[PDB]
RNA sequence: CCAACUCAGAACUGGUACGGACAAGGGGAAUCCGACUGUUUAAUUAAAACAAAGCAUUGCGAUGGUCCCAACGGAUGUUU
RNA sequence: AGGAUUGGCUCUGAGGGCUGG
RNA sequence: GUCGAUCCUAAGGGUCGGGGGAACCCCGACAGAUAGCGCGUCGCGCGUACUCCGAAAGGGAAUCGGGUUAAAAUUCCUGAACCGGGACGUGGCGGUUGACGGCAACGUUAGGAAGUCCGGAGACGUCGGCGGGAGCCUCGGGAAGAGUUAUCUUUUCUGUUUAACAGCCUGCCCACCCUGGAAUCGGCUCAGCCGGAGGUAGGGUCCAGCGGCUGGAAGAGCACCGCACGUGGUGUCCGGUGCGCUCCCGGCGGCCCUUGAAAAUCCGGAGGACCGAAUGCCGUCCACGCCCGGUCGUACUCAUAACCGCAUCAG
């Protein structure tokens, strides 16, 4: 059954800390505890070991990523920015 | 029921003060200190155990106290790398060396272009 | 009066940094011939957590240039680094995330981290999680480079200074609320003895300029001048302004 | 303490120069031959009583034989 | 079938001779009755010859030119085929029946040793007699 | 052939007694203060006081900010 | 918040394991 | 010699040189021709300024039953083992100079080697669920003694033992190997979860043990019945049960802006300079035999009377 209408994973905090802080922390609470796709082996077996560290259970590849997500938004932009600069220099 | 006491002057339940209860031929229970658990050899990266070697305290591996066959594996990097790891290195060494030969030859054909 | 809390920190004692479990200083290789002229290949062996440091660290193994032995290094991990990756350091290293290049070889607009201030100092700028520096322009005549630091300040550095391509991994750490005094306790337990903080207005006059009074209140401007002596310099030090930063001020 | 499984092996160790003594222990179902050497006490078990008597008189002279 | 044929140099990947170079003597792609998998009979080098240099004396050079070989049956999955070839006559010296008896195996190894050493001294097939480093 | 103890129901029965001793929340409608857990005047004050997460302001890019030191030097700093 | 039940005794039902083609 | 101190390093402490200081003193390897080590036989090679102190709860070579005193014992007695050193002898092993077996995981008791280099062990948080081992608790039968007995009670009670160490067997939960090639997807946990990066299945390897058997070892211990006032005999047996309790281990999962010591020491590996014999020398981490074992602590209380509180103090 549906055990909580909206609280979800932040139900472990009971009635403490205020709704906004529970709502705010829910995004990162879900993301840091979720499985992520491993580009190396192709499995959804990447989980956070510590803040910024993401290891694949299957192939054993350990990757440095975001604090609470494997890939941050700025990380994608940096890769494309660096790629564009490399092409011009390597032209 | 019979209750026990430490047989030494160590009075605190530290990891090195572990014990087992033994019943002697005299019909009484007594403690005998048990050595801590040991990990045994493990692979440098994956951390999996190295097969064929028992798990003992470091001093128990001393050559005088352990037969040679129990602390060795008959293979290159035996006791240090698993069989899979050794296989990976051998193939990598051969294939990478072959690729170097291809690079060397490939640049000789272009060097003469003039 | 007595020595205030701010003054007691300089003596060390119970205010020294908690460094028992730290893995060591994170820094580039020592500048040598290989990095000055060509490039040297390294391999990432593991990405580890350093207590008290948000950014993860990377252990890299290098082949020693002239000795028969391995050369171990500890780098601040850039976002995207992974174990088994090849890392190239030197003047002729390609522009890819993780490589360490001199600023002279890095084009304008690139994102870099752990930027050296002095050639060979092994990295002092943009080392915290999610932080980076942006290369602005090059000055071939002076042999210097302009970079934008995380605080938004522009600085001149010699073009020989090295920098790692990319941003520091672990970004977004501070967005998550702590929610608990205990979480703050664990955060500062591995940093130093700075938490919790008692407000000066809650103390007695003997131990703080803000102390005392039949009501809790400062009683004088909390903005203190730059040249105030230790023990008097509390509050907003040399404040150019105060109050909510609205408009262009918060730029 | 070590156990000898072959009567031939027991005789060989009984002729060692460090074999101080031999003791005969007769149980209700077998006979145990125990020889005290420098490092170990070697024991041989002989279930057949008649087969044990033959070994008893085949021990080298000069070795202290005792019955338990 | 195509490249796993006699005189084809291979590298052992498992067992106590992992990393050793060997040459196929007989190939069993279909697999014998006792072994229902692809395997071959190989004659490899258990001990590579040392580095032979001019400054060494004649007696010293002779010892450093010694080779020691092994005869073995190996699964196809436990060898790495190479593009190199070693054309040494071993059809009569090395056979499946040889491995049955220890005395026969020793004689074949000694005979295989003689043919590897003479080939090594000619300066040909330097790769085969060179130790693989990994 | 060998099994351990959980649950449910029924009949009968005692002077309605039966969580029989032991054990073991009184409850409700509201106001004030502090969000909460935590801490505090050892030996008269445990609180509405302190701390707290959150929020905001200030200084500082190392030839630096803050601080210690008679001097030399040092803490923050294995830091950015 | 509010309400009901609770002993003793004699029974009934339900919930298992290992062997045997 | 076997329990500790002793050894190792932790937070830190004490210091050389140097820099300060009237000096007492301050900083503390930071201003510097380190300490020395290794291999040959005095020479070569290496060589980053502490061979220091700092744990009777961290790390760590090796001892177990039985017996013994008015008062001591893992220290004394007896028996049985082990550890670290030293020295040579006998036998065995290797020479295709440096073993053999297995497709493999790996197995076997031996089975070259220097400078140099590399890895591992030592070595690690916390919580929760499961599984395994040991001790205890508990149920039934057999035999031994005791208690109850006007009545009832094939009943109630006490016990009914097996050390280190050595060999062999077993092979948990995992990990690993071979064959083979999977959708009608299957396997699988309490929970997960796993599989063309090779599942299920079939057959293997390895690892744990505080598991089994034997030796140790019944000759001991205990109980009981005698004879004398030391000595003999009998027994010590066969099963069941578990969300049970204590300890240990295994494996999995949860938690962190917290990721939860170091060093001594030990093991393994990469490399192969150099080295024997034409078969007698060389090599040998194998078996057996021989010798050696420092110094200090060790009684007793550990508390409503042996510590502190003025005390034989309800703290
Ligand atoms: K082994
Ligand atoms: K003062
Ligand atoms: K504090
Ligand atoms: K405060
Ligand atoms: K005030
Ligand atoms: K509480
Ligand atoms: K400073
Ligand atoms: K100690
Ligand atoms: K520890
Ligand atoms: K004893
Ligand atoms: K023992
Ligand atoms: K004593
Ligand atoms: K008292
Ligand atoms: Mg997988
Ligand atoms: Mg605050
Ligand atoms: Mg006050
Ligand atoms: Mg004042
Ligand atoms: Mg009101
Ligand atoms: Mg409150
Ligand atoms: Mg208090
Ligand atoms: Mg008070
Ligand atoms: Mg009070
Ligand atoms: Mg608010
Ligand atoms: Mg000064
Ligand atoms: Mg000891
Ligand atoms: Mg220290
Ligand atoms: Mg001093
Ligand atoms: Mg001095
Ligand atoms: Mg120095
Ligand atoms: Mg020392
Ligand atoms: Mg010391
Ligand atoms: Mg200790
Ligand atoms: Mg005593
Ligand atoms: Mg380790
Ligand atoms: Mg919890
Ligand atoms: Mg259990
Ligand atoms: Mg299988
Ligand atoms: Mg026995
Ligand atoms: Mg007896
Ligand atoms: Mg406990
Ligand atoms: Mg070697
Ligand atoms: Mg005593
Ligand atoms: Mg007493
Ligand atoms: Mg006591
Ligand atoms: Mg006093
Ligand atoms: Zn992966």
XYZ file of C-alpha atoms (C1' of nucleotides) and ligand atoms in Angstrom, chain B residues 9, chain H residues 72-73 75 298-300, ligand 12:
8
model
C 46.232 -10.230 34.980
C 52.946 -20.079 46.190
C 52.191 -21.763 41.229
C 56.294 -20.257 37.932
C 54.532 -12.702 41.180
C 52.109 -13.052 48.975
C 47.325 -10.486 50.113
K 51.658 -15.543 42.285
